[PDB]
Design a protein around this nucleic acid. Structure first.
Lengths: 182, 182
DNA sequence: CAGCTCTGTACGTGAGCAGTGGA
DNA sequence: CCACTGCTCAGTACAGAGCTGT
């Protein structure tokens, strides 16, 4: 099982379906170096240098970023999880975000949100795009922001430098949200 | 983590390097694909239906085949098993084969045998070929038959069918030795 | 320098997969 | 909404750098 990385006062929280064999194994979030998470982060000026999964523990204090997932059971892939298993999941995730209250809940890939929505919000988001969504985290001021899966096991973009747009945008959205309190 | 499947009176005993993330995760030998292992067996004629990692414990009593690995820690794989480890692995592995004494000890993939031999027999082998090897298992009538990895991490045997050859040999070598044996 | 060894890296394929847009 | 696109991830041979003796 893979450790959450959560503190108070976060800008961002990256949010997987649940940890995979590799990540269970290394004990850190997003080991590849195939997978694009860590490059995206560097690419987008979200991190000033280029880091890797070994540095995950530093992300809250130094970049105000943290990690977690709907499910905590570790499997090979989402296709191994029950519907049931996801319910108790986002139930427990809502409860976390109500506790930690970051500015923005960022979802890895349409897939995971698409669930959360027709679960937490009782609504099949039809025709979904990436980035800021209309609903806040229930009982919070936390935004949901949907991000193309960091997994290169994907159609596009996959390729770390085309998901950078969404990182830049996220980054700016963060930036916007700190000016509000001027 | 991954349990040996071993009896007495086995013809063949596949010996993998160690148990990777899938296999670890599912307590069963050669899950993949890509492992061409369950494939080859069938299309090599060594089984008469194509089966998989969950018939693994039936391979003794039904086809007199058994399983085990040189080293036993779970890793990704593979290029990350220590220098040491492997040596000590081989001390245990020998003991088992003197315990159980299968007609043959198939090594799945070079570098294990490559290394086993380097350890057990005192020989760094020139230009290893796949197939039967000079030496018996010390103090047993058990043969050593090298075989190219069934991992698909391996470019120079692109497809499963680039490997069945050794399985058809393997059959034969067993088939010869089986009588003898009137 | 062949031969010896000591790392380093560059390699095919399919299966699984996220996403998009095709029946 | 099955299919279709790019791209991950699951040991081993040769390159070359750096010693030995013709």
């Amino acid at each position: 099982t893979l450790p959450d990385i959560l503190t108070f006062n976060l800008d961002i929280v990256i949010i997987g379906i649940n940890p995979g064999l590799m990540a269970a194994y290394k004990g850190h979030h997003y080991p590849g170096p195939g997978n694009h998470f860590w490059k995206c982060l560097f690419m987008s000026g979200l991190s000033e240098v280029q880091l890797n999964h070994m540095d995950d523990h530093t992300l809250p204090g130094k970049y105000g970023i943290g990690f977690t997932n709907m499910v905590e059971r570790t499997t090979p892939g989402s296709k191994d999880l029950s519907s049931k298993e996801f319910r108790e999941g986002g139930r427990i995730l809502v409860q976390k975000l109500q506790k930690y209250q970051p500015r923005i809940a960022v979802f890895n890939g349409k897939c995971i949100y698409e669930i959360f929505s027709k679960e937490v919000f009782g609504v099949k988001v039809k025709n979904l795009e990436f980035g800021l969504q209309p609903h806040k985290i229930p009982d919070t001021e936390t935004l949901c922001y949907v991000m193309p899966s960091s997994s290169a096991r994907c159609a596009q973009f996959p390729r770390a430098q085309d998901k950078v747009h969404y990182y830049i945008k996220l980054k700016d959205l963060r930036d916007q949200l700190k000016g509000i309190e001027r």
